[PDB]
RNA sequence: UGGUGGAGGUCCGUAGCGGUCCUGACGUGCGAAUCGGUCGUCCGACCUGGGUAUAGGGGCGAAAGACUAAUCGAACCAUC
RNA sequence: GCCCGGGUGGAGCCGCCGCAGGUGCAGAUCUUGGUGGUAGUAGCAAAUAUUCAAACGAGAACUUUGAAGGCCGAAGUGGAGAAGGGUUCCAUGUGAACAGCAGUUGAACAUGGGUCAGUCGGUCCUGAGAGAUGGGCGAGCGCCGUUCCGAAGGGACGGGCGAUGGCCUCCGUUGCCCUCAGCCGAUCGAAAGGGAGUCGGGUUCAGAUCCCCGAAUCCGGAGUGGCGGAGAUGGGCGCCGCGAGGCGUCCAGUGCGGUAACGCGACCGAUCCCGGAGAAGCCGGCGGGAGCCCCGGGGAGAGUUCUCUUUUCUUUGUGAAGGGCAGGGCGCCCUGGAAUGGGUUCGCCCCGAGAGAGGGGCCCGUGCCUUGGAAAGCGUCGCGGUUCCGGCGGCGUCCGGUGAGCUCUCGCUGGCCCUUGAAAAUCCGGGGGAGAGGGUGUAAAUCUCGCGCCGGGCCGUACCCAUAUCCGCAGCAGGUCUCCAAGGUGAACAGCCUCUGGCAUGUUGGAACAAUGUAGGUAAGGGAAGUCGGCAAGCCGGAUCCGUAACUUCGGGAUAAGGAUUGGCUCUAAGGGCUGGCAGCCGACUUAGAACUGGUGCGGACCAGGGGAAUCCG
RNA sequence: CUGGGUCGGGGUUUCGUACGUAGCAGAGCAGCUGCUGCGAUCUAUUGAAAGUCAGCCCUCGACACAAGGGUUUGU
């Protein structure tokens with residue numbers, strides 16, 4: 062995901078959990094050379110990423 | 121430098137974002153006098169101050 | 171895509187010359203550049219003795 | 220007398236630092252001070268990075284009026 | 300100066316009477332802009348070097364692939380960082396401009412991508428220093444000053460009062476009182492100082508100690524603490540029971556062992572006090588351990604095979620964290636008491652303030668074995684997915700020896716100082732003994748022991764790091780801080796050649812080989828007659844064995860000066876370890892002597908002091 | 918039916934005696950009971966081998982080539 066530079070890892074985890082009613086294993090955040098924060102969100106093993114991406118709209 | 125501060129990185133990001141050329145639909149508006157981007161900066165020529 | 175073999179750098183010549191030096195060749199007073207002490211330190215000799 | 224030991228602002232000499240001579244090259248140059256051979260020193264008053272202090276009639280000077288951002292027998296900038 | 304004609308042009312302009320002025324250019328090394336001759340000229344010459352074939356393409360000296368010949372030569376033209384740069388990184392596309400020739404190429408242009416951390420750093424500490432308040436000064440913005448002309452603590456074990464919540468039990472939350480007591484001065488100051496804790500394998504076009512897999516680890520937290528184990532369960536008496544074992548009274552129980560160094564899995568404890576670690580220079584010598592190099596073999600795969608070569612080359616392993624054992628060190632302990640002095644080092648040094656000789660203890664154990672761990676990695680041979688695959692299979696990853704060898708690291712010991720070579724954060728041990736627990740048990744308070752539960756937020760992370768990504772106006776022969784470091788020769792990290800890795804000759808090529816240049820050489824006879832002046836060039840040069848003057852501050856002069864030798868090959872002699880005056884088995888480089896031999900040549904390239912006699916000055 | 922050119926062959930000349938093979942030549946050394954190996958060098962083949970126009974001399978040997986191409990010029 063792309064998030065704003067004012068978000069903690071805890072905030073990103075909570076936002077994903079509320080929005081997409083899923084579980085998050087961990088979060089890794091970096092700040093792109095162009096300015097916004099990029100977040101890699103690793104889900105729980107019992108949730109697969111492909112179906113969540115389906116529900117999102119990106120396939 | 122690999123070690124850099126947050127504000128330095130943000131300023132660099134803004135400067136890098138500013139370096140694109142103009143959109144092709146600009147030059148054929150009605151009240152237009154712009155032919156190209158005259159503020160483009162190359163890393164070899166001008167050294168960004170700092 | 172093959173990995174080419176390493177170009178040969180043999181040691182047969184230098185080991186044959188080393189065998190000659192073992193026998194005592196090429197070690198005359200003509201073929202020596204350092205001092206006697208530099209070639210074999212007298213302190214080390216005395217230590218061993 | 221023979222060993223041993225391993226001192227030293229010690230000697231030859233690399234790296235490093237410096238810059239004698241050719242008054243060589245170049246001299247609208249590679250370069251607003253470089254290049255080559257040859258040279259001085261190379262465990263100590265040694266060489267060097269970063270941090271920090273000293274600001275213009277002031278600083279700093281193993282002292283040449285030297286250095287103080289290619290500017291120094293008084294820096295640079297703006298104004299009068 | 301002006302009026303007409305012709306042409307171009309496309310929207311304003313002039314005559315006369317007055318009024319007003321920023322009103323007339325050939326120059327001012329005038330200002331700005333433009334353009335010539337020079338001139339298709341100077342020039343595109345620092346660091347050895349390129350050639351053949353094919354492909355793509357309109358187009359090839361410069362692109363790509365293959366082959367050949369070269370260079371850098373581990374103090375690199377290699378592999379990574381710091382500062383600085385800031386998208387230059389990666390993929391695709393283009394060839395207008397730029398890359399001083401060209402380009403199918405680019406650090407150019409155009410589209411898109413790319414930097415993932417509890418453990419790597421910042422973040423914290425303080426250093427040299429910087430800087431508020433109090434105070435002082437100052438017309439004033441302000442300045443001085445950093446403990447100095449200050450009521451500088453907003454904390455706490457515990458006790459008492461008052462209220463609340465939770466089974467109001469016991470504790471928490473406060474509010475008040477009693478009691479307890481320093482600060483070296485707020486705060487800032489290091490991406491090289493201090494600073495707990497992450498390693499291995501795999502993966503991308505570009506990211507990995509960060510992603511995935513697998514093994515760990517530090518810190519912090521937890522009403523009921525989740526749990527084990529420790530604190531712990533004994534003795535006496537009266538008994539019962541044949542005894543085993545079981546009852547009723549008393550008493551103890553904040554662990555135990557070793558003579559000692561000290562050991563064991565824990566083994567209560569506050570304010571306070573003491574100490575340690577953090578926390579220390581430069582140089583020398585020696586020893587231990589790794590990595591690398593080296594030698595003799597087993598494999599596996601390659602190279603040569605005109606002749607020879609049991610041949611030449613490549614490869615042949617195990618992380619962190621535990622456990623054990625080597626191996627190093629001890630200014631640690633016990634017995635005993637030594638001259639006929641002894642022990643011992645390369646050197647030293649040690650001993651009645653207790654040596655030798657026995658027996659122990661402690662610390663580091665980065666080495667070996669094991670858990671990890673063969674399951675992974677790698678080298679080969681063969682099958683698959685005709686591919687999109689951490690694909691599947693076989694085999695192997697073995698045995699030894701040495702070294703004043705190089706680098707790193709640990710340790711011992713000494714030398715030098717009119718030089719004595721940081722602070723704080725943080726952590727730990729001890730001395731004390733204020734307190735707490737229970738009355739014999741369901742034991743309690745308390746545990747730095749074992750396992751178990753939860754979490755670790757924020758920022759940086761791509762690439763260059765330099766004869767093209769930095770600074771010099773630039774792809775500038777300049778400058779710019781570091782780590783890694785093979786073989787041969789050789790004293791050597793010197794010079795020369797080569798391997799791993801890299802590169803295409805430094806912003807162009809072809810053909811000629813005149814003068815004059817720049818940079819190298821060689822010259823008959825003479826030998827400084829040249830020149831201001833032996834400027835430049837030239838002679839000498841390493842090592843071994845002889846020999847070495849005047850003068851002297853007695854240390855030097857000194858490599859003084861001056862001589863001889865140096866190759867190749869075949870021998871001899873001497874210099875050691877381990878096991879059982881001796882015997883056997885291994886072995887690493889040296890030194891000396893001799894013979895033979897070459898067209899007198901042998902420090903054969905490279906490296907590499909000309910000398911002497913005096914004067915002046917310091 | 919002539920020409921040069923390339924290659925080859927001779928001549929000249931430079932250097933100094935090639936590789937291989939053989940040797941009861943070789944300071945010596947090791948192994949097997951006189952023989953076999955290592956061994957710098959030496960002797961014979963060996964005035965040998967190699968080079969020799971690119972700006973040397975002759976060839977009458979071989980090979981292919983050579984009756985071309987372009988631009989101009991009138992009293």
Ligand SMILES: [Mg+2]
Nearest residue numbers: 164167769770
């Ligand atoms: Mg630049």
Ligand SMILES: [Mg+2]
Nearest residue numbers: 228229230261
């Ligand atoms: Mg000296």
Ligand SMILES: [Mg+2]
Nearest residue numbers: 241242243244
């Ligand atoms: Mg000159």
Ligand SMILES: [Mg+2]
Nearest residue numbers: 244245246248
């Ligand atoms: Mg000139």
Ligand SMILES: [Mg+2]
Nearest residue numbers: 230231260261
């Ligand atoms: Mg010297």
Ligand SMILES: [Mg+2]
Nearest residue numbers: 273274277278
């Ligand atoms: Mg002053």
Ligand SMILES: [Mg+2]
Nearest residue numbers: 282283284292
């Ligand atoms: Mg003067």
Ligand SMILES: [Mg+2]
Nearest residue numbers: 275276292293
């Ligand atoms: Mg003045």
Ligand SMILES: [Mg+2]
Nearest residue numbers: 308309310311
């Ligand atoms: Mg108009």
Ligand SMILES: [Mg+2]
Nearest residue numbers: 319320321322
């Ligand atoms: Mg006007």
Ligand SMILES: [Mg+2]
Nearest residue numbers: 324325326329
């Ligand atoms: Mg004019």
Ligand SMILES: [Mg+2]
Nearest residue numbers: 339340341342
């Ligand atoms: Mg020209």
Ligand SMILES: [Mg+2]
Nearest residue numbers: 377378379764
């Ligand atoms: Mg490099």
Ligand SMILES: [Mg+2]
Nearest residue numbers: 378379762763
């Ligand atoms: Mg690199």
Ligand SMILES: [Mg+2]
Nearest residue numbers: 388389405406
């Ligand atoms: Mg690129």
Ligand SMILES: [Mg+2]
Nearest residue numbers: 398399400401
């Ligand atoms: Mg060009």
